[PDB]
Amino acid sequence: EDRTLLADLARLGEWTGNGPRALGFWKQLLAGADDPALREHAWRLSLQMFDFDSAIELLAPIGAQRQMTDEELDALVYSHETRGTPEEGEAWLRGYVQRYPKQRLAWQRLQQILEHTQ
């Protein structure tokens, strides 16, 4: 999230007060059993911390099991762009648009990517 995010985290009991330690904790909890809300707090926080690696790790599995929201999709595409790596971003986007081919925003991001000719 943007300006809400700290106020948002402070309401959760599972927010232990420290960006990094919270993320590793939640990653460990999610490794045992998934929790959608905790997964979201996790990747929101990943973006907050400029941890695009963790953002991609937490976001990509969603679109292997379900059609992502526009917010969920922009996050994973932005994360790939922002960290280097836009090749494997375009790679992932192709094929995401083959399952769930009805999310228009996915095709728009893929079209933008390929509008990088030369």
Side-chain angles (χ1 to χ4, degrees), residues 2 4-64 66-114 116-118:
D2 300 64
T4 21
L5 170 64
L6 186 48
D8 291 343
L9 293 175
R11 304 183 199 108
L12 325 171
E14 60 276 29
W15 164 249
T16 52
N18 178 261
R21 288 201 262 95
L23 182 62
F25 183 40
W26 299 347
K27 275 167 149 206
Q28 293 193 84
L29 294 180
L30 286 175
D34 171 274
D35 181 321
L38 187 79
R39 186 152 232 120
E40 174 151 324
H41 295 308
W43 65 253
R44 286 215 278 160
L45 180 61
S46 280
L47 300 173
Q48 182 65 31
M49 293 180 284
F50 298 157
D51 190 356
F52 309 107
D53 291 350
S54 292
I56 298 172
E57 181 199 324
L58 288 156
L59 278 169
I62 298 177
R66 182 238 301 164
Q67 194 205 89
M68 300 160 162
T69 74
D70 288 355
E71 208 214 352
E72 281 167 8
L73 174 103
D74 266 354
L76 173 54
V77 174
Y78 174 89
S79 288
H80 273 285
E81 257 291 87
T82 311
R83 66 159 190 176
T85 234
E87 306 85 4
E88 73 177 66
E90 168 190 345
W92 173 89
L93 235 188
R94 309 181 107 110
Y96 176 82
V97 279
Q98 306 197 299
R99 32 192 168 95
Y100 324 103
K102 295 184 144 185
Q103 183 178 353
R104 204 193 288 284
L105 178 58
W107 298 93
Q108 264 148 8
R109 307 264 99 124
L110 173 59
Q111 152 174 321
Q112 289 174 200
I113 290 170
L114 316 183
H116 267 216
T117 312
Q118 301 332 93

